[PDB]
Design a protein around this motif. Sequence first.
Motif, mmCIF file in Angstrom:
data_model
loop_
_atom_site.group_PDB
_atom_site.id
_atom_site.type_symbol
_atom_site.label_atom_id
_atom_site.label_comp_id
_atom_site.label_asym_id
_atom_site.label_seq_id
_atom_site.Cartn_x
_atom_site.Cartn_y
_atom_site.Cartn_z
ATOM 1 N N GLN A 13 0.833 -1.203 0.000
ATOM 2 C CA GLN A 13 0.000 0.000 0.000
ATOM 3 C C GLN A 13 0.868 1.253 0.000
ATOM 4 N N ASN B 279 0.451 4.400 0.187
ATOM 5 C CA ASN B 279 0.299 5.438 1.203
ATOM 6 C C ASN B 279 0.703 4.959 2.591
ATOM 7 N N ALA B 280 0.552 3.665 2.880
ATOM 8 C CA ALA B 280 1.071 3.140 4.134
ATOM 9 C C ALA B 280 2.590 3.233 4.151
ATOM 10 N N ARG C 163 3.470 6.868 4.790
ATOM 11 C CA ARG C 163 3.257 7.218 6.193
ATOM 12 C C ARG C 163 4.328 6.607 7.078
ATOM 13 N N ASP D 160 -1.824 1.024 9.091
ATOM 14 C CA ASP D 160 -2.075 1.811 7.887
ATOM 15 C C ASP D 160 -2.268 0.907 6.674
ATOM 16 N N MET D 161 -1.475 -0.156 6.576
ATOM 17 C CA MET D 161 -1.589 -1.068 5.443
ATOM 18 C C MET D 161 -2.931 -1.795 5.473
ATOM 19 N N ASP E 101 -5.715 0.921 4.512
ATOM 20 C CA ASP E 101 -5.731 1.206 3.081
ATOM 21 C C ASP E 101 -6.417 0.085 2.305
#
Lengths: 209, 209
Positions: A64, A66-67, A70, B90-91, B94
């Motif tokens: 991912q 965006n993960a 971040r 976060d992963m 998402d």
Amino acid sequence: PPYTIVYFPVRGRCEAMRMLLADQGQSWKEEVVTIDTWMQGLLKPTCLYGQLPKFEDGDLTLYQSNAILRHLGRSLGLYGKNQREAAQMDMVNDGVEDLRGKYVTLIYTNYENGKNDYVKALPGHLKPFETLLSQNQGGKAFIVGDQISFADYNLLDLLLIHQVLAPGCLDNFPLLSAYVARLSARPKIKAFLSSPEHVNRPINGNGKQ
Amino acid sequence: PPYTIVYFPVRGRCEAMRMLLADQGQSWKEEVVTIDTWMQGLLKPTCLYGQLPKFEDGDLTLYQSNAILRHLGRSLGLYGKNQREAAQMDMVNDGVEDLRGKYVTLIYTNYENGKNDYVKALPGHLKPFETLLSQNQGGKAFIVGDQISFADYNLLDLLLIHQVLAPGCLDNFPLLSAYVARLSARPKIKAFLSSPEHVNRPINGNGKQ
Ligand SMILES: N[C@@H](CCC(=O)N[C@@H](CSCc1ccc([N+](=O)[O-])cc1)C(=O)NCC(=O)O)C(=O)O
Ligand SMILES: N[C@@H](CCC(=O)N[C@@H](CSCc1ccc([N+](=O)[O-])cc1)C(=O)NCC(=O)O)C(=O)O
Ligand SMILES: [Ca+2]
Ligand SMILES: [Ca+2]
Ligand SMILES: [Ca+2]
Ligand SMILES: [Ca+2]
Ligand SMILES: [Cl-]
Ligand code: NA
Ligand code: NA
Ligand code: NA
Ligand code: NA
Ligand code: NA
Ligand code: NA
Ligand code: NA
Ligand code: NA
Ligand code: NA
Ligand code: NA
Ligand code: NA
């Protein structure tokens, strides 16, 4: 560390994380996956969601895009100075992602028939970022606060690919135009943007841009 | 705090954050925006990306449902115990968002013609979460680590709406089905799920589910 990016041979969802690493003075390894390798179906089922990028930080393996951004923001101190800023950076990055997803749909599924509509609607999708800049030191710093963050690298990449799609799309967005010029002139980013590995990499996998 | 949720009269992208607030013993105000009001065009131009939810936390105003979730997760201690867990949360989130976006498109634009294909493809999209559960204490804890996180509230909501869309979709995912039952049994969650405010609220805005 160490860092490894596993991805198709395009800029796509990895150019922002690459710029982030370069601007932080970090080295990384590229593991390039070709389309012919991907079609053989060995790697794909081993990916959490069946997709790339895959990212390694030591023995941490992430998916991912965006993960990954971040995580780099958190681990390298590119996530603001307090919770208020971190929340705003997330709200920015989610907006970047929303527009990126629309860009990807245009490029890969509807370029000839959809481009005119997309470019006509684009100012309305760029204005929120102009507004955010206007409210943060009149736009002379970063997208949130006065230190660069993971969200800046993603926003910068989004703006750069949109300048290729629609030259002059920032003509009426003076804060965004100056922001792009300013971040692009950061020495490590300027060097990255002129490096052969970046220049020779197409933006997308179908050659459209 | 104090907290206000400004949103359409549906569960949609706010039921996860509502469950989170309820489970953490927090109170909040609902500012319900009807379709009629939204179409007046007064509130929309004032929203950062022209969309809801909008969230007020004291003097901080946020948009983007996942940024709001992450902000509540950060400020209420629902974001793991180290950088590794935070990245994994976060992963997870998402991946939840990726499927939620597909769900929304089905509901609001293509329910009649798209549902059969969507339900056929659903197991492939839920399996990653069963796998993650199977690798974290055989599924007896949370999606990442041993403390509930913002990603749990979002995944829970995703699973619950998919059970309404596709009864039996968790039949071959015993960890996910047990996880739904366990988290729904948490006393403050179970009370929220029984409350008229939630019960009377439709999942989506078009009468489809
Ligand atoms: N939400 C995910 C989205 C990832 C995603 O879209 N991955 C695409 C690659 S980026 C877009 C892309 C597609 C194809 C090429 N190419 O070179 O052929 C390059 C880039 C992928 O893995 N597609 C393969 C598959 O699903 O089997 C994220 O943010 O990381
Ligand atoms: N990326 C954003 C996506 C937000 C989003 O899709 N917002 C929708 C509402 S959720 C889906 C939805 C649609 C309609 C209703 N309804 O009751 O009429 C309820 C929910 C919206 O504001 N639509 C109005 C517009 O764009 O003008 C996020 O995660 O918050
Ligand atoms: Ca891409
Ligand atoms: Ca399009
Ligand atoms: Ca929704
Ligand atoms: Ca605003
Ligand atoms: Cl700068
Ligand atoms: Na390449
Ligand atoms: Na992209
Ligand atoms: Na990128
Ligand atoms: Na995201
Ligand atoms: Na956007
Ligand atoms: Na906690
Ligand atoms: Na995505
Ligand atoms: Na929508
Ligand atoms: Na569909
Ligand atoms: Na299928
Ligand atoms: Na807990």
